[model samples]
Target chain A: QVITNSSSSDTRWHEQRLPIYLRQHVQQSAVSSALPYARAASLE
Target chain B: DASDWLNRLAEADRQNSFQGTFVYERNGSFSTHEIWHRVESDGAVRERLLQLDGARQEVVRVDGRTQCISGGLADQLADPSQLASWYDLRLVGESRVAGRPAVVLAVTPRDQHRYGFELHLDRDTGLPLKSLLLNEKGQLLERFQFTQLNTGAAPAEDQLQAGAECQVVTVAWRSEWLPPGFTLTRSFMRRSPVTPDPVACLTYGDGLARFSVFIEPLHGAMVGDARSQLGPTVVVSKRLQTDDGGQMVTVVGEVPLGTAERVALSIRPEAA
Candidate 1:
């Protein structure tokens, strides 16, 4: 996929012209798991 | 399938020279290699390859034959035409690789029997830095790419030469079938000390991603039709016993496993 920072080019003297890295999260509820907490829970 | 797609890659193959760093890994170990490709204006491709990991290093091939091999493995060269009989290739899509915009080409097989490939070619320079191989399930099999590519800075003549320590050797190993559109680009016979037998270096590419088939004779070693996966690629090795002896046919790269298995099993002698 094309990530355009500007019409001219991504390279420029200014940092603002640089394209921001895209971070995304897909459906992870069922697909993701976390390790057990080492410390006691606050609720307890 | 996407031949209608537009690609701006300068025509490559025996007509260009480019160098880049590429990483190849499988199982628990990963290694890097420096590759120099020199292609004349006609269509003659000369390549010099060196590994940058562990004690594994050797010049794989020149035009498309096993020349010299060192390290721990060796085998004979298989005819390039056998694998060349399987698939149809097409230039498809476009994108960017190693920070440069590129034209994407897909080398789709004529049948589901073999794996397919998608390559990202630098539009301005026609050099390939990123490529992907896929199976019938559309799962990625393997990846070959350069984290950085300098299209402007082409490799010099000396940069593509094998050193004096590098001895030239020929190979006797060959394959029976390669998907169509894939011509034997380079075949190197590698014989390393760690292994029981030499491994044939056979590479097939349809102007895109290349699959390296290493045929290691197994003799009496026990192995199976096992497989391993990495990121988007899969490797499958099958054990085959022939009249002469047994061999471990290993298929490595970013492509489908079934195709790899088929390619593994499809190894046969070239008829005179």
Candidate 2:
């Protein structure tokens, strides 16, 4: 089993500091990649 | 002996009260930082470090443990004895930094797994005044040197306080293999900025060097593997397929790139 511990918390400051184009790339892929898996799971 | 100086350095870290401005340089990046360190009467060591330029990154710690950090600066030792097996520690000579006398010490790695270190310790208090990390080619990878320091008095209460933006952040995973002297220090989990999943972070440290391994769920994402070296620090990311889904293992730290890549590939889920 995977261990779970939440004693530490990191802010989103670093991501916010990234370039606009790169951030957009990250946002786009996150949705595009998850969409297929989400749809497949829903159909099952 | 050199080991005696190492002992003094360790003691000074716990007992000294000093504040100074130091410059950190690594590859293409160079930044200045102000540090305030105080030893409380109760024996706790409180420290507040703030970047003087760029992002104003800040961090506050008590008893050598971080209490809060501002921005991304949160990306944050061991025995002196038996030191010969890993590195050759020697008192190189004398030097002056921050307008104070200091003794120079050199720690050269015995193998390619680690880097060498040149340390200039304050002759009076034994605090580090200048430090350099050198690669196997004798090239300087990083430098930490003080511009000004004052050990005459403890840092004031207000100075030790962290900024309002200083948020407490939180690390766990394990690596199947590590460099000879390196060992696991702490493990915990934190939310990933790029993905919805939480990332398990495992930190390992030798007596002088340290690195961190981060394991994040990919959720079938088509992210490519990445690797980069920012001076002494190296980042190696590898994609792994597990029974559940894809996992991204990233190793980041001051270790060599090859060492980091090996660590990234060696991460495995903890077994029952």
Candidate 3:
């Protein structure tokens, strides 16, 4: 992916061209959910 | 079986045409996006991704090559090889995802410097249903999970195109030095709005993990070294002075901070 400006307010992409930001949806979906059972049971 | 799953994940992206919505989370960040993929009769693969919310970012690709991407999501590509030397992949067990059965694989780092990964591969299709990156303390760094998936149908050709604003970047960049096993996978240049100058960007990968380096002329401006980490990705920036002038180099990837710092410092001008 070659980061390009999407919106004037979406300056985060322009600011950090290499790492994509998920701040917007992350904030909107703030509820914590259980990790996958396989993931949770992996270390065991 | 573990390596088979990894190989299947790599090949599935190229051969299978599927569409689904997935969530990506790193640290305190989270985002949901939809992906559309189509494979032509001639074996060419085209993919499109669209962020469901926020700025509604988007990207498109053809045959594993990027055609366009939203700002900040560029250089998000990879392959699989040299993986066994870097980490040990083992079958942890079986689980479920998106209401489907999944085989969990644990990717344990060979050294403390790099983060570990846990992949939940779909038992029937070998596709990656979920992925997780973990720090040294076993803390979750990032999560990529598919909420819905459909492999029976291909995406319409119209759904795989980039928008008017998704301009293709011309490649014009090189890295003087990269770690052994690392190779330049792609290069892209984006013109700076301030001047006719362009920012040179280069992506490198060792067949599994990938990283990108950006170079921009600083003219006479002076900037100090900087470093930071976001989930599994690390960023390192440093100012370098050559006989011609000073330049700012930024290295970003899902590698160790120390490794990123060294890569940033090793960047030098091309030999004239």
- TM-score, chain B, model 3, is 0.76
Residues forming the 10-long window of minimal summed lDDT in candidate 3 chain B? B70-79
lDDT of 1 at B36: 70
Q: Fill in the DockQ of model 1.
A: 0.01
lDDT digits (tens) for residues B45-96 of candidate 3: 7777777656556666676455775543433221566787778889999999
Cα displacement (angstroms), candidate 1, residue A43, comes to: 53
Could you tell me the lDDT of residue B272 within candidate 3? 45
DockQ of each: 0.01, 0.03, 0.05
The lDDT of each candidate is: 0.51, 0.67, 0.64
Q: Please provide, for model 2 over B1-272, each residue's C-alpha lDDT reduced to its tens digit, 9 standing for 90 to 100.
A: 67889889878867878898887776676777788989988888888877777565666778746587554432220057766778998998999999999999999898888889999989999988888889889899877888999995999999998887778753334678888888887677766665577767677778677676767776776555665555665666677777668777877666787888888888887666
- The per-candidate TM-score of the B chain, in the order shown, comes to 0.54, 0.84, 0.76
Alpha-carbon shift of residue B15 in model 2 (angstroms): 2.8
**Candidates in order: C-alpha RMSD to true structure:** 18.0, 11.7, 9.2
Tell me which of candidates 2 and 3 scores higher on DockQ.
3
Best by lDDT: 2
TM-score of each: 0.49, 0.74, 0.69
Q: Is the docking of candidate 1 incorrect, acceptable, medium or high quality?
A: incorrect
| Candidate 1's iRMSD | 24.9
Alpha carbon RMSD to native, model 3: 9.2
